[PDB]
Amino acid sequence: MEMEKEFEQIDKSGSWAAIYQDIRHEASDFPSRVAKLPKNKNRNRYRDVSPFDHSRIKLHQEDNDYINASLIKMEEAQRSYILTQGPLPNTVGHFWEMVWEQKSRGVVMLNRVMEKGSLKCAQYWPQKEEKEMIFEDTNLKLTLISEDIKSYYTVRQLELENLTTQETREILHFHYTTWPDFGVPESPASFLNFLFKVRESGSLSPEHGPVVVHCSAGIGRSGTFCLADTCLLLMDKRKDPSSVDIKKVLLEMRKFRMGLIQTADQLRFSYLAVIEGAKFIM
Ligand SMILES: Nc1cc(-c2ccc(Cl)cc2)n[nH]1
Hints:
The protein is of the alpha/beta class. It has one domain: Alpha-Beta Complex (Protein-Tyrosine Phosphatase, Chain A), CATH 3.90.190. 30% of the residues lie in helices and 22% in strands. It contains seven helices and eleven strands. The strands form two sheets. The protein has a nine-stranded mixed sheet, with helices on both faces. It has a two-stranded antiparallel ribbon with strand order 5-6. Helix 2 (16-26) packs across helix 7 (264-280) and helix 5 (221-237) packs parallel to helix 7. It is globular. The protein starts with a helix and ends with a helix. The structure holds 3-(4-chlorophenyl)-1H-pyrazol-5-amine. 3-(4-chlorophenyl)-1H-pyrazol-5-amine (JKV) binds next to strand 9. It is a peripheral membrane protein.
């Protein structure tokens, strides 16, 4: 079926939970043996969210190459994404090692450091220009260059230096600051505006490594971001845009990381975002 009228049909019939459970039942199951090794317990935020072995990002390190991060490679759309958990106190150095080694231009953050009175990720970037951060375990330096605070999101320019080679690179940090503590946004308008700002920066383009996107576990809000982006790109590429099937795209992405889209409300919000976005594109 088309999207917008499939949407109204699920609303009127109140069957979002059943649609979402079908997706959960059909989703791929692949091994995640490296994630479960005892030496990696303090590298995982949640025991039930792990990267598959076949798609995990490997650190270029012979001691321990593990990080909780997955490469989502979308062949027809010609887009790739790295989805990862919010960094932990003992993985902030690994996080920036990955950014460096994978040649990423942008980092997309969809959570606040504290939500619901608890810490959802480490404070992994500097908050003042004159107070830079040094990660001694991976030999990197990170400096805040500029910060632009808007009503729904903040953009930061960061300098990452490899202290071993003295090479430097500019990284863009796109921080969506207004996702509510509970539920999903009432309108997708600010989330779509944010997606377009990431696109306009070059951070999603083939001349760079894959964008790094995270929330707390790296599957819920993060899944919503890449699902909406990929569906909109396919609607532009194809002769028949109404042939884009959001459920089929989601199952393809779940071949590369488990659990993408965590609730039936997030699924409904993803439909809403693609529907409204397809009108603005034209
Ligand atoms: N004067 C000045 C420096 C910069 C700059 C420096 C370093 C990065 Cl990574 C990005 C921008 N903009 N303007």
